[PDB]
């Protein structure tokens, strides 16, 4: 029940216009308390109302603040970076040069609730305008195994900031008045304590668990959880199934049993997820092994010799830091089946990319992907041979399983294409996720399909806008099939036809 | 006395954008257009 967002990973790059730019930040953070990504809070101009961020308590990545001439950011409740992923390779806060050519900007940063950086670092630079924040004594958030990386020019030229009030400990505060003095729970801490903790008094002694601390030393009165979350109690590990018996020496069933997913415990795995005999929620089993359905149960099995190539796709493995299917990459796309993982197809793969040493790619390349029946994740199309018609490498594609979605929503997207028709037609089932078809300026069919008949959950829509209008296909006999009126069709052709 | 503009050598960077140098970091970086996004403007964003 805690609201969660994904996060960006723009790194500093604007998203048009500082208007543009803000609503784009505003409609991804609205009432998101938990950012499965990373927190970027850049280009915010003077006078514009980050209200929003006063809801995020949590952040899965990093959290960057930069060049922003706004002059308070009211991350007043942010409790927890886990920094499961770096800014510049060992930065869990970044914030750096928040500031107006004019000598003025940000100013407030009442972070008054950060107590815990689980992995990283902090950098501070070039903030002037900034206030209070040369105070924060960081040996208590930050883990002193990172100590080391802190690299923080902690100088202001304005000056004209109100003193940390006197009740603060140390003089340590994030902003003005005694409601935003640091709170200890790590240094003050007693010796015998496990870690966190509340006070120098061996009673107010956390659970190790307790990621940010504790109202309380047992498991489920933490803060915030340090591994896993079993329902209201913070967990090293997920309950197995089942538990070792030390009398009988045999297994027994565990009734408390719960499935690793994320960093929780469920009841259940996803409907399109994988399960281990661990009883673990994967996204794909290792290599020499497989994925098969069983008594209701998508699981792994192991192959003895003779199974499937362990296909990556563009994102993952050594495909790592890919935008695209390319002319360096197609050629490890073979004999590939299912794609674990994703797909993209951007316009520079048609182009070539000098950036990433990567040479123009020959559409009759493409031909390759006609083996692959099964994506895992989602399927970007942004780009496709203008000469051609249809998605033809796609012709025996059948079931888009939407683990991974693009911005966590889109496992099907077709974008600005001279295609005519999608030529989809061996397509049976879009398991999760929503499809969007837009900009395809030639695109005549795709209205006739019902999309719902493919759909393996309630709430999954579709976005089918600015392609070539209905009625303008209608008019140039651009239409399905006479034999083919039930479910529509892919193309004019009886064989594009879904029902015949 | 912020963000100036990027080198000649820069030009197929953003992929849908303007290339813009950022001196407090010595780095450069892109500005795309309306409805895409990705630190080089790559993917076409759902509004
Ligand atoms: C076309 O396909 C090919 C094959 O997939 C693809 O080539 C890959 O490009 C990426 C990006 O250039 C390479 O990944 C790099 O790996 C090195 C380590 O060897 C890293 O140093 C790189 O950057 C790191 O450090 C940066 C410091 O600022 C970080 O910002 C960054 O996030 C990284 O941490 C980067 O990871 C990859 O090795 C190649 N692979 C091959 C086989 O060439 C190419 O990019 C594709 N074309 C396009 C346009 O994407
Ligand atoms: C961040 O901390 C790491 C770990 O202490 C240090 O990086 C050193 O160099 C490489 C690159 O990470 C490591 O394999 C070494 O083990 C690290 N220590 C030594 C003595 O070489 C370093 O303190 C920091 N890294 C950077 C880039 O500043
Ligand atoms: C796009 O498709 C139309 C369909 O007839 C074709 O006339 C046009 O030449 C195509 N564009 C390119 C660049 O091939």
Same mark, same amino acid.
């Given at each position: %029940?805690?609201?969660?967002?994904?996060?960006?990973?723009?790194?500093?790059?604007?998203?048009?216009?500082?208007?543009?730019?803000?609503?784009?930040?505003?409609?991804?953070?609205?009432?998101?308390?938990?950012?499965?990504?990373?927190?970027?809070?850049?280009?915010?101009?003077?006078?514009?109302?980050?209200?929003?961020?006063?809801?995020?308590?949590?952040?899965?990545?990093?959290?960057?603040?930069?060049?922003?001439?706004? %002059?308070?950011?009211?991350?007043?409740?942010?409790?927890?970076?886990?920094?499961?992923?770096?800014?510049?390779?060992?930065?869990?806060?970044?914030?750096?040069?928040?500031?107006?050519?004019?000598?003025?900007?940000?100013? %407030?940063?009442?972070?008054?609730?950060?107590?815990?950086?689980?992995?990283?670092?902090?950098?501070?630079?070039?903030?002037?305008?900034?206030?209070?924040?040369?105070?924060?004594?960081?040996?208590?958030?930050?883990?002193?195994?990172?100590?080391?990386?802190?690299?923080?020019?902690?100088?202001?030229?304005?000056?004209?900031?109100?003193?940390?009030?006197?009740?603060?400990?140390?003089?340590?505060?994030?902003?003005?008045?005694?409601?935003?003095?640091?709170?200890?729970?790590?240094?003050?801490?007693?010796?015998?304590?496990?870690?966190?903790?509340?006070?120098?008094?061996?009673?107010?002694?956390?659970?190790?668990?307790?990621?940010?601390?504790?109202?309380?030393?047992?498991?489920?009165?933490?803060?915030?959880?340090?591994?896993?979350?079993?329902?209201?109690?913070?967990?090293?590990?997920?309950?197995?199934?089942?538990?070792?018996?030390?009398?009988?020496?045999?297994?027994?069933?565990?009734?408390?049993?719960?499935?690793?997913?994320?960093?929780?415990?469920?009841?259940?795995?996803?409907?399109?997820?994988?399960?281990?005999?661990?009883?673990?929620?994967?996204?794909?089993?290792?290599?020499?092994?497989?994925?098969?359905?069983?008594?209701?149960?998508?699981?792994?099995?192991?192959?003895?010799?003779?199974?499937?190539?362990?296909?990556?796709?563009?994102?993952?493995?050594?495909?790592?830091?890919?935008?695209?299917?390319?002319?360096?990459?197609?050629?490890?796309?073979?004999?590939?089946?299912?794609?674990?993982?994703?797909?993209?197809?951007?316009?520079?793969?048609?182009?070539?990319?000098?950036?990433?040493?990567?040479?123009?790619?020959?559409?009759?390349?493409?031909?390759?992907?006609?083996?692959?029946?099964?994506?895992?994740?989602?399927?970007?199309?942004?780009?496709?041979?203008?000469?051609?018609?249809?998605?033809?490498?796609?012709?025996?594609?059948?079931?888009?399983?939407?683990?991974?979605?693009?911005?966590?929503?889109?496992?099907?997207?077709?974008?600005?294409?001279?295609?005519?028709?999608?030529?989809?037609?061996?397509?049976?089932?879009?398991?999760?996720?929503?499809?969007?078809?837009?900009?395809?300026?030639?695109?005549?069919?795709?209205?006739?399909?019902?999309?719902?008949?493919?759909?393996?959950?309630?709430?999954?829509?579709?976005?089918?806008?600015?392609?070539?209008?209905?009625?303008?296909?209608?008019?140039?006999?651009?239409?399905?099939?006479?034999?083919?009126?039930?479910?529509?069709?892919?193309?004019?052709?009886?064989?594009?036809?879904?029902?015949? | 006395?912020?963000?100036?503009?990027?080198?000649?050598?820069?030009?197929?960077?953003?992929?849908?954008?303007?290339?813009?140098?950022?001196?407090?970091?010595?780095?450069?970086?892109?500005?795309?257009?309306?409805?895409?996004?990705?630190?080089?403007?790559?993917?076409?964003?759902?509004?």
């Amino acid at each position: %029940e805690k609201k969660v967002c994904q996060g960006t990973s723009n790194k500093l790059t604007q998203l048009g216009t500082f208007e543009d730019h803000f609503l784009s930040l505003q409609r991804m953070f609205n009432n998101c308390e938990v950012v499965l990504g990373n927190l970027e809070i850049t280009y915010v101009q003077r006078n514009y109302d980050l209200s929003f961020l006063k809801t995020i308590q949590e952040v899965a990545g990093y959290v960057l603040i930069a060049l922003n001439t706004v %002059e308070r950011i009211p991350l007043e409740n942010l409790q927890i970076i886990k920094g499961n992923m770096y800014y510049e390779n060992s930065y869990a806060l970044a914030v750096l040069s928040n500031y107006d050519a004019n000598k003025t900007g940000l100013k %407030e940063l009442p972070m008054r609730n950060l107590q815990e950086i689980l992995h990283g670092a902090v950098r501070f630079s070039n903030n002037p305008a900034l206030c209070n924040v040369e105070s924060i004594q960081w040996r208590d958030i930050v883990s002193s195994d990172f100590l080391s990386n802190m690299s923080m020019d902690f100088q202001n030229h304005l000056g004209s900031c109100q003193k940390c009030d006197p009740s603060c400990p140390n003089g340590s505060c994030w902003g003005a008045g005694e409601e935003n003095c640091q709170k200890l729970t790590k240094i003050i801490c007693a010796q015998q304590c496990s870690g966190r903790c509340r006070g120098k008094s061996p009673s107010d002694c956390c659970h190790n668990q307790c990621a940010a601390g504790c109202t309380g030393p047992r498991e489920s009165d933490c803060l915030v959880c340090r591994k896993f979350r079993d329902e209201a109690t913070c967990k090293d590990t997920c309950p197995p199934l089942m538990l070792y018996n030390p009398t009988t020496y045999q297994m027994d069933v565990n009734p408390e049993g719960k499935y690793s997913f994320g960093a929780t415990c469920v009841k259940k795995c996803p409907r399109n997820y994988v399960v281990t005999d661990h009883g673990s929620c994967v996204r794909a089993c290792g290599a020499d092994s497989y994925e098969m359905e069983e008594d209701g149960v998508r699981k792994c099995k192991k192959c003895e010799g003779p199974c499937r190539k362990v296909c990556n796709g563009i994102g993952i493995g050594e495909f790592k830091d890919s935008l695209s299917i390319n002319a360096t990459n197609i050629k490890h796309f073979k004999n590939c089946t299912s794609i674990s993982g994703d797909l993209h197809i951007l316009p520079v793969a048609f182009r070539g990319d000098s950036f990433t040493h990567t040479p123009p790619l020959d559409p009759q390349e493409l031909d390759i992907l006609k083996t692959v029946k099964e994506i895992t994740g989602f399927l970007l199309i942004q780009a496709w041979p203008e000469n051609r018609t249809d998605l033809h490498a796609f012709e025996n594609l059948e079931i888009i399983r939407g683990r991974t979605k693009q911005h966590g929503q889109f496992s099907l997207a077709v974008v600005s294409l001279n295609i005519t028709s999608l030529g989809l037609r061996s397509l049976k089932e879009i398991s999760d996720g929503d499809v969007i078809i837009s900009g395809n300026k030639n695109l005549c069919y795709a209205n006739t399909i019902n999309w719902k008949k493919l759909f393996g959950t309630s709430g999954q829509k579709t976005k089918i806008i600015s392609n070539r209008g209905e009625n303008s296909c209608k008019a140039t006999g651009q239409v399905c099939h006479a034999l083919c009126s039930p479910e529509g069709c892919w193309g004019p052709e009886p064989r594009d036809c879904v029902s015949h | 006395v912020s963000i100036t503009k990027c080198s000649s050598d820069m030009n197929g960077y953003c992929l849908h954008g303007q290339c813009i140098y950022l001196v407090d970091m010595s780095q450069n970086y892109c500005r795309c257009e309306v409805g895409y996004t990705g630190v080089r403007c790559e993917h076409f964003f759902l509004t």
